[PDB]
Every structure is written in C-alpha cells, then in structure tokens.
Amino acid sequence: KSYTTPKKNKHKRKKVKLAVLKYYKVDENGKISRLRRECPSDECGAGVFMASHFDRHYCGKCCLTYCF
Template sequence: MGKTQKYKYYKIEGDKVVRLKKFCPKCGPGVFMAEHLNRYACGRCGYTEWKNSGKKEE
C-alpha cells in the first residue's frame, strides 16, 4: 500500500489547526472520508454520505 500524506488533510490558520476533510461518523476521529463528486465515502467501513445536488425537484 502507498503512504498517506496526512499533512495535506490539515491547514494552519493563525494559531489554529483546521481539518480539511471530514471524519467518518462510524469509525470516529482519525479516519478521514474520501471526497468524490457526489458523495463522501469511508474507505475503512464503507459508510457513504451523499452530497446535496443543490437542485429542488417539484
């Protein structure tokens, strides 16, 4: 397996560290979710959250 570059998942704003990716709600802190075009997915447990398309169907 390749090495994960976790330093790319954080950003420093002033004296605070900000996470750029979401944590998996099932696996807990430390397990990031992958961001796809229409969803967020956890590679560890398979949990998926769908993004809102922004369209309202009537």
C-alpha cells in the first residue's frame, strides 16, 4: 500500500501528435532544411536524431557532449 510519503513520478513519454514535421523544415522547393545536427561517428548514422538543448548537444548513444 501507501505511506505518508508521496510517491515519486517518472519521466513518461508524453503523447505529441505529428512531430515528424518537426524533423525537417518543409520549404517550397524540394530541398531538405534541417535545424538539428547529427552524430558524426560511424556507430550511429544520420538517421538517428539528437537532443535539442539550448547551449550543449548530445549524440545518439555515444554520450559525446558537443559544446562550444
């Protein structure tokens, strides 16, 4: 059962509808425009996308923190 202490929440994947158009910027001419970077290593390809932070960056599985 439960104690007096409240239970701890967990990071669940929230349901967002049609986020695939957030991958590339859909322009007029048929050329893909991208706002994100990729992982330049050969372990993960460009099909794997990255974590969009504001100053630092994250690879797919390599955990390589790309900073300025």
